[PDB]
Amino acid sequence: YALEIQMYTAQKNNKKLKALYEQSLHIKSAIPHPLIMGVIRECGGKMHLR
Amino acid sequence: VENPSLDLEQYAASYSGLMRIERLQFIADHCPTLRVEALKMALSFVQRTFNVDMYEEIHRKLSEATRSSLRELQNAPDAIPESGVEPPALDTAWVEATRKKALLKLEKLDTDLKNYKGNSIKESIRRGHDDLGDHYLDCGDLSNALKCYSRARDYCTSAKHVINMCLNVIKVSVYLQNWSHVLSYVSKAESTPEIAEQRGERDSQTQAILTKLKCAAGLAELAARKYKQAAKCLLLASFDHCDFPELLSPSNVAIYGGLCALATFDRQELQRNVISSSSFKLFLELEPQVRDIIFKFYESKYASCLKMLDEMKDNLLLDMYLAPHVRTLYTQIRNRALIQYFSPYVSADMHRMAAAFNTTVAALEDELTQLILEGLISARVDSHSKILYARDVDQRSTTFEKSLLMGKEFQRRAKAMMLRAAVLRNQIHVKSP
Amino acid sequence: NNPSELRNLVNKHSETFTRDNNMGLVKQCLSSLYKKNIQRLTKTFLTLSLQDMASRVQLSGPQEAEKYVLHMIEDGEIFASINQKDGMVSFHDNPEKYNNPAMLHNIDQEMLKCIELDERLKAMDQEITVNPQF
Amino acid sequence: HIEELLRNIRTQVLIKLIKPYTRIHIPFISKELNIDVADVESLLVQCILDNTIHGRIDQVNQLLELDHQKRGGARYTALDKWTNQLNSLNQAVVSKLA
């Protein structure tokens, strides 16, 4: 999901990034503390500001 | 009127089956230039699907359009040889054949339905009723398709099976042209699968049933002239459905949800529903004209907004469902816009006001007079030097005068009652003897 | 709210008016429309020209616009002033501010009427109280 | 976003400023914010409609007739609601007779 978000931010389509982000949230509960959670968040935050 | 900057190609392509032929014929009727191409696009589509009636009727209008000296289509090829674009004529064999095959087809489907009734498996009976139902819609027979689907109903055994049928029934109900049936059946469909689920069908749902039903309701209400409610149901429709080639193309939802909101909505509602919404946002993006219109109206950009608005007007008027509403909504956008202008200004200069609404001072004067009397704008024109002022209402003057007046009429009715009671008690009324 | 049509109607309907003999009253209803048409303008405008009043009301003479409000000034159906330098009419509209003692006394007089009206009703309600109910 | 942030500061600053006056001039606020009269005029219009500035404009003298013209009102409107029900009530009661 992260690599996909890294491609979709460079390609620049706002729509797909929003769906990717919601779909990634469901998985989040059983994750511990990783780097991946900030990377995914980072795109979500920007889309929220828009 | 005319305005040929309605892309004919897109309007055809975005539709299919009966809805396409029907719509195309509406636009050909209202616009002069666009008619010719519309009749050919209609005829190419009518040759497929298999319907006889449209072929006779559309070809009849084409036979007027060429043959007369009124139109320019008689001397247009200046001789009829063969070519490739050449006005066609009726084919005596095609019209019998289409009907013959349609009828023959119906018989195959009936024979199939008969064994499914014999086998007594409910789902096979229901599928049959769908197969007979769908054929009646290709041949052109509007009524019989609804009867087939009605029968389908007591063979249900799942929330999905109810959903398929109601949508199918909705397809038919548009052609009968009664909107109230769409609302009963959409509600029925919405209620049946757990009030449109309770989980999002897990992560997401493959095809949004939710989006189809709101958009059908929104079309029904627009027409009803329930306009505020029509924007309200429709905005929630998303691009999930992708396209609808048997009820409402995705271009028209953007137009409908925008223009239908702008007329009747106040500022709080505009920001909350049309602007902040992720859902409507794909639609706003789809055509920038609808979007620019909303912001420009909101920003007090009325001069840019109305200029884009007149240009679009005649195009939106060629649209079948949308056309009687253009005038009603446009008036509502202007009279709301007039209030909306006077809210921040105690004292406004009329020349700026006139220029913003794109009418002359004189015209604008007569519109305002109407708003002061009928409408709520408590303002007075100083027409001497053209300044719009600046009436302060007084909560006291209106209550005191009313209390005193109300007191006169209360007493008078009481006096009137004593006189009524007086003849009744001593028992006289008018008599001929 | 158009006098020209009302006028044409009165000649169409004429024989009825005469046989029923509420002639002359029917004439007043026509003048009262012209009064209404002038008075609605007041609500809308602070200042309006006489030429402008005259075209819209269909008086067709600014001289008559000035004559019509002046009749109404004496009557006290309108609060207005005429500016013959500018060729305007200025509307006022401020008979009461509602904080006058004049208004207090008027409201006080209206209460005495109510208290007597109630007293008529009490004697009449009591009268039915004496009568046996059905 | 930076353009929006600039507008955001100026808009909050305006709401603080507004309070000592009931007549404040547009070239005075434009000068204080550090922009021309026309963008301030456009901001004010949008602000009254959103109701984060209270009042109306006098464009034939370049003033803001800010609102602090409040008094009571609450008594006067309650008497109006009371006054409208009494008309409907008298009409109703007298109409019951025969």
Swiss-Prot record, chain B:
The record's Gene Ontology cellular component field reads: COP9 signalosome; cytoplasm; cytosol; nucleoplasm; nucleus
Domain named PCI is located at: 233-395
Q: In which tissues is it expressed?
A: Widely expressed.
Q: Where in the cell is it found?
A: Cytoplasm; Nucleus
What PROSITE patterns does this protein's entry cite?
A: PCI (PS50250)
The UniProt GO MF terms for this protein read: GTPase inhibitor activity
The family note in this entry says: Belongs to the CSN1 family.
- Species: Homo sapiens
Give start-end of the signal peptide: none
One of the GO biological process terms? protein neddylation
> What protein name does the entry list?
COP9 signalosome complex subunit 1
List residues, modification Phosphoserine. S432
From Swiss-Prot, chain C:
Q: Where in the cell is it found?
A: Cytoplasm; Nucleus
For this chain, the annotated S-S bridges are: none
Superkingdom, taxonomy of origin? Eukaryota
> Where expressed (tissue)?
Widely expressed. Expressed at high level in heart and skeletal muscle.
Q: What else is known?
A: Amplified and overexpressed in some osteosarcomas (OS), suggesting that it may participate in TP53 degradation in OS.
What does the record note on quaternary structure? Component of the CSN complex, composed of COPS1/GPS1, COPS2, COPS3, COPS4, COPS5, COPS6, COPS7 (COPS7A or COPS7B), COPS8 and COPS9 isoform 1. In the complex, it probably interacts directly with COPS1, COPS4, COPS8 and COPS9 isoform 1. Interacts with CK2 and PKD. Interacts with the translation initiation factor EIF3S6 and IKBKG. Interacts with ERCC6.
The record's comment on protein family reads:
Belongs to the CSN3 family.
Q: What does this protein do?
A: Component of the COP9 signalosome complex (CSN), a complex involved in various cellular and developmental processes. The CSN complex is an essential regulator of the ubiquitin (Ubl) conjugation pathway by mediating the deneddylation of the cullin subunits of SCF-type E3 ligase complexes, leading to decrease the Ubl ligase activity of SCF-type complexes such as SCF, CSA or DDB2. The complex is also involved in phosphorylation of p53/TP53, c-jun/JUN, IkappaBalpha/NFKBIA, ITPK1 and IRF8/ICSBP, possibly via its association with CK2 and PKD kinases.
Q: What is this protein called?
A: COP9 signalosome complex subunit 3
Which species does the entry assign this protein to?
A: Homo sapiens
Span within the entire protein?
A: 270 to 403 of 423
Swiss-Prot record, chain D:
Q: Predominant location of this chain?
A: cytoplasm
In its UniProt entry, what is this protein called? COP9 signalosome complex subunit 2
As for subcellular location, the record says: Cytoplasm; Nucleus
Record-stated family: Belongs to the CSN2 family.
Query: What keywords were assigned to this record?
Result: Cytoplasm, Nucleus, Phosphoprotein, Signalosome
What kind of modification does the protein receive after translation?
A: Phosphorylated by CK2 and PKD kinases.
Gene that codes for this? COPS2
Species of provenance: Homo sapiens (Human)
State the Gene Ontology terms under molecular function.
transcription corepressor activity
Q: Which GO terms describe its cellular component?
A: COP9 signalosome; cytoplasm; cytosol; nucleoplasm; nucleus
